[PDB]
Amino acid sequence: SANPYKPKSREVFHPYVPAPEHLPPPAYTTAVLKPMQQFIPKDFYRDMRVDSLRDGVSLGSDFPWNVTHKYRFWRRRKYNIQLDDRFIRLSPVTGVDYYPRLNVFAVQWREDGQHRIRWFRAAYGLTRAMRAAENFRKTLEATGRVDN
């Protein structure tokens, strides 16, 4: 249900991770990076890599993969592959919905200040039922039976 009690935005959250307000500066800060004088403290890279991901904005070019050490996900990695960006069961026409238990499409539209929903069985075919529902909504809008 689209209840008030829900976030207004649907974007991934990357909240700030502030450090304790009583700790001193890290150890990695004592490094001389000058071309002439070079100084690499112990665990310099270890500390700096972690420290860089504090802000939350500087997630890096490859964020999903710069922290997943587990091989489970790496094993599945692929290169040079085209992928879609839309779920199969998502029609672009407004008012269309799909029900998993009923296994059927529904169309919501308002007529004369009253809510009405129609059934669309998808047993004969997913694409056929989806197109039938989209055509029904378009016919509603064309004939002018939807309030505006």
Binding site: P64, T68, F73, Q82, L83, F87
Partner: protein, 105 residues
């Protein structure tokens, strides 16, 4: 039924290639999207946070040990004593604020 049939043939073919030990090549074309939730992106943040936490804890321990040692270093540590004797600074018995001198006790 047809999809469960085609999957088998595909898998069989791929397995044959793996057995053969041929170079790993796949169908580099437009794949569908059966997923809906951004599980990978949502999952990365937890590891980031965890890492942060770990780092913090490390820092805390480092600081604790350094702090404990610093005070023990030579030339710093001293048997500090009060300048004025505490007895003189002690409040008198007739002080109105002394315990047992007001009808509240």
């Amino acid at each position: 039924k047809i999809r469960q049939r085609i999957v088998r043939i595909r898998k069989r073919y791929m397995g044959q290639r793996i057995e053969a030990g041929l170079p790993p090549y796949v169908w580099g074309g437009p794949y569908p999207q059966y997923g809906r939730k951004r599980s990978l992106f949502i999952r990365g943040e937890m590891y980031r946070r965890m890492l942060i936490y770990s780092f913090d804890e490390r820092r805390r321990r480092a600081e604790k040990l350094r702090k404990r040692r610093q005070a023990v270093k030579w030339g710093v540590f001293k048997l500090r004593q009060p300048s004025v004797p505490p007895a003189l600074t002690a409040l008198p018995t007739y002080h109105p604020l002394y315990p047992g001198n007001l009808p509240k006790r």
